[PDB]
Amino acid sequence: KFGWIKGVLVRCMLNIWGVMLFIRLSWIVGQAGIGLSVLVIMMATVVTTITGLSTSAIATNGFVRGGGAYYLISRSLGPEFGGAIGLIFAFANAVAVAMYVVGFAETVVELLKEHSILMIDEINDIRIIGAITVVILLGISVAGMEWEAKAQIVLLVILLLAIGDFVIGTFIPLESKKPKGFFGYKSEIFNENFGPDFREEETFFSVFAIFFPAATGILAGANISGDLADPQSAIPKGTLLAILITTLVYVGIAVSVGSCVVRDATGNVNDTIVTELTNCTSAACKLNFDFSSCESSPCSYGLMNNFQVMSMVSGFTPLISAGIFSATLSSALASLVSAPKIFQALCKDNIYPAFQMFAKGYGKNNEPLRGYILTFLIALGFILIAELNVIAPIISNFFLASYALINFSVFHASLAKSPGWRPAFKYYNMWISLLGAILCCIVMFVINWWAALLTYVIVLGLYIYVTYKK
């Protein structure tokens, strides 16, 4: 089978490290400050850590036999909690597929813009590339899965190499890169970038909703709990270590990109300030550059305007593009196999008879082709809207709802003293799980109150329907 490392840690890191690490973290650091983005990352880390503690408590309760995160949750805490969590998580993964594919397509379109290869329009090209990508990924999922075990390590190595390449690039200031920002590690840039600089229609929690899908993916290790040799011990430590490593990398990258790149920058070489005019207080002014004229007009570079800041900073640019592709495609593929399997397992249990027609599977491996079609349609529908910053809040809402369900389910089972609930995890507390559920609920209401209200209305309706069923 799979050892704890290759079965939980690698998959969790690959699912967590997705689209926001490379093409949105720098923008988040620009919009907030360095310290305030550290606060955002810490809040997401607290949410995912409490959810991971709850998930480990679920894993340590019961028997090894049985695979899938929905299976463990349903056999541990109630048909009603199992069904609600499974449905919400399946929808969350289905829309996460779209978010990751849109990030990949945006990166591809940005790379094509360098060669001036435009087919119809930037948004239209993003839509076309996303549709092609999701079709290809669905074909890969339904046809080729034996290569996945060998490809996980390759993708993780490529992503780590891209991260190291960016970190190396931050330590090599270049004169050519200076007009586009990236003056190197300077105290002036750190001082300027420490405070928030939110623009119009940008707040702390909008940026948090953009970032939060980065922290998601912690349930990748539990999704193949059956495939693990010792799921009761592999899942807890694997998930917790993956959360720790990804959070440390996020914090380090945020601080580095905030301390090495200015918020606003032009892209023209002959912008130097030989004689200071009125003693400009900007960090770029102290670095012999004049970006004061940029803020009046639209800027095309800097933390606030360029989503490919990390690609620019890195010494070997195509490695980062491979890293972006690796991260986005790995996360999209992980979410594209998690949702159909969860939906099929939910339909086998016949929790909702309306969805029972999706229980049919085809092939030797019992592939949920009907479920695959449903998740493909959901992902495609969310790809026809081709903005990462509008899709990401939806991902945040649904993953926060799933995490609140998991935390509240374990807390309610501990409080009710359910006969089948006796977790063996040492670091699980029912009150910390309740705190995590409350935090997720409050955060998802703060991000978007009506979307959250609709989510809870649906969740309560499903819970009541399953509770009172024939």
Ligand X SMILES: CC(C)CCC[C@@H](C)[C@H]1CC[C@H]2[C@@H]3CC=C4C[C@@H](OC(=O)CCC(=O)O)CC[C@]4(C)[C@H]3CC[C@]12C
Supply 231's token pair: 């799921």
Shorter beta-carbon distance to its own copies: residue 427 or 449: 449
**Cα dist. 407→81, 102, 127, 180, 401 in Å?**
11, 30, 36, 45, 10
Residue 458 has what DSSP assignment? H
327 and 19 Cβ atoms separated by less than 8 Å? yes
310 and 323 Cβ atoms separated by less than 8 Å? no
Three-state SS at 362: strand
Tell whether residue 399 is among the known ligand binding residues.
Answer: yes
**198-237: contacts with ligand POV (CB under 6 A):** 203-206
**321-360: contacts with ligand X (CB under 6 A):** none
Partner from ligand POV, K ion, Cl ion, none contacting 219, C-beta within 5 to 8 A by type:
Cl ion
Shorter beta-carbon distance to Na ion: residue 50 or 329: 329
Strand partners, 362: 367
Supply 361's token pair: 């599977």
Shorter beta-carbon distance to ligand X: residue 3 or 196: 196
Shorter beta-carbon distance to its own copies: residue 19 or 443: 443
Q: Which residues of 381-409 are buried (b: 16+ CB within 10 A; e: fewer)?
A: ebbeebebeebbbbbbbbbbbbbbbbbbb
The CB-of-328 to Na ion minimum distance in angstroms stands at: 6
Answer left, alpha or beta for residue 198, where phi above 0 means left and psi between -120 and 50 means alpha: beta
Supply 274's token pair: 């030989």
Q: Does 248 bind ligand X (CB under 6 A)?
A: yes
Q: Does 223 bind Na ion (CB under 5 A)?
A: no
Residue from 107, 193, 216, 256 binding Cl ion (CB under 5 A): 216
Tell whether residue 403 is among the known ligand binding residues.
Answer: yes
Distance CA 386, CA 127 (A): 6
Residue from 2, 7, 9, 18 binding Na ion (CB under 5 A): 18
Tell whether residue 215 is among the known ligand binding residues.
Answer: no
Residue from 86, 217, 238, 340 binding K ion (CB under 5 A): 217
The CB-of-162 to ligand X minimum distance in angstroms stands at: 9
Answer left, alpha or beta for residue 201, where phi above 0 means left and psi between -120 and 50 means alpha: left
Shorter beta-carbon distance to ligand POV: residue 98 or 285: 98
Tell whether residue 18 is among the known ligand binding residues.
Answer: yes
**Cα dist. 244→140, 217, 230, 241 in Å?**
31, 13, 21, 5
Site pattern 152..191 for ligand X (x: CB under 6 A):
--------x--xx--xx--xx------------xxx--x-
Q: Which of 387, 391, 397 is nearest to 446 (CA)?
A: 397
Residue spans of alpha helices (H) in 24-68: 25-31, 34-60
Q: Total residues contacting Cl ion (rule CB under 5 A)? A: 9
163 and 253 Cβ atoms separated by less than 8 Å? yes
Q: Does 469 bind its own copies (CB under 8 A)?
A: no
**428-457: contacts with ligand POV (CB under 6 A):** 428-431, 434-435, 437-439, 441-443, 446, 448-450, 453-454, 456-457
Shorter beta-carbon distance to its own copies: residue 417 or 426: 417
- Output the residue with the shortest Cβ distance to ligand X: 252
CB contact set of 120 (below 8 Å; sequence gap of 6+): 128
Partner from Na ion, K ion, its own copies, none contacting 16, C-beta within 5 to 8 A by type:
K ion
Contacting range for ligand X; rule: CB under 6 A; set: 116-124, 226-234, 247-255, 295-303: 247-255
Shorter beta-carbon distance to its own copies: residue 352 or 445: 445
140 and 336 Cβ atoms separated by less than 8 Å? no
**398-427: contacts with its own copies (CB under 8 A):** 412, 415-416
The CB-of-457 to its own copies minimum distance in angstroms stands at: 7
Distance CA 452, CA 444 (A): 6
**164-203: contacts with ligand POV (CB under 6 A):** 203
The CB-of-284 to Cl ion minimum distance in angstroms stands at: 30
331 and 17 Cβ atoms separated by less than 8 Å? yes
Q: Does 377 bind ligand POV (CB under 6 A)?
A: no
Q: Which of 19, 44, 16 is nearest to 324 (CA)?
A: 19
Distance CA 65, CA 200 (A): 52
Three-state SS at 228: strand
Residue numbers at the binding site for K ion (CB under 5 A): 16, 18, 216-217
Q: Would you list which residues are annotated within the binding site for chloride?
A: 18-20, 89, 213-214, 217-218, 399, 403
Residue numbers at the binding site for ligand POV (CB under 6 A): 203-206, 393, 401, 404-405, 408, 412, 414-417, 423, 428-431, 434-435, 437-439, 441-443, 446, 448-450, 453-454, 456-465, 467-470
Residue numbers at the binding site for ligand X (CB under 6 A): 39, 42-43, 46, 160, 163-164, 167-168, 171-172, 185-187, 190, 196, 198, 203-204, 248-249, 252-253, 255-256, 259
